[PDB]
Design a protein around this ligand. Sequence first.
Ligand code: A1A9Q
Ligand code: CL
Length: 167
Amino acid sequence: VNSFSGYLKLTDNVYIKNADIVEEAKKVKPTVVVNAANVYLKHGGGVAGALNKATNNAMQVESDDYIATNGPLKVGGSCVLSGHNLAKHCLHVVGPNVNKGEDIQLLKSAYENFNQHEVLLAPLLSAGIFGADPIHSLRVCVDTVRTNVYLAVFDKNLYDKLVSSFL
Ligand SMILES: CN(C)C[C@@H](CO)Nc1ncnc2[nH]ccc12
Ligand SMILES: [Cl-]
């Protein structure tokens, strides 16, 4: 039993809700919140900009030190950093950005990072401003993630389309 509330159950392990991931994380304070990161951990917009703003830029400061030490992530890769005031940990995961010409096949690799954590609050990877089809992202999530994932879909219209189209 966990404290996530109001989710629709899609499969044994995947749950979904129309919600603002910032507000959800603040309410639940999950062990792991997933950020829709880029390889430079530059949290400018989309989920990343919103999560970073909610940390008063502390996420960006921490991320800049991470990059200075380790260099960029790989597309499809991840790193674990602090969750600041939002969660215990933030799993920064880089899905492919179609608006940059990146290989959509890497979306499965991106979701594989979730399997290293028993329970996560997460967005749909490569959706929104990353330019991929969210129906596809949800399908890859369901077919790749085996741990317990609570998906927050900000757009209510998109959420209804995702539920109504789910196979
Ligand atoms: C907007 N939508 C079409 C894309 C999704 C990523 O697929 N973006 C989010 N999902 C959940 N919470 C969020 N807060 C801020 C942005 C955001
Ligand atoms: Cl977005």
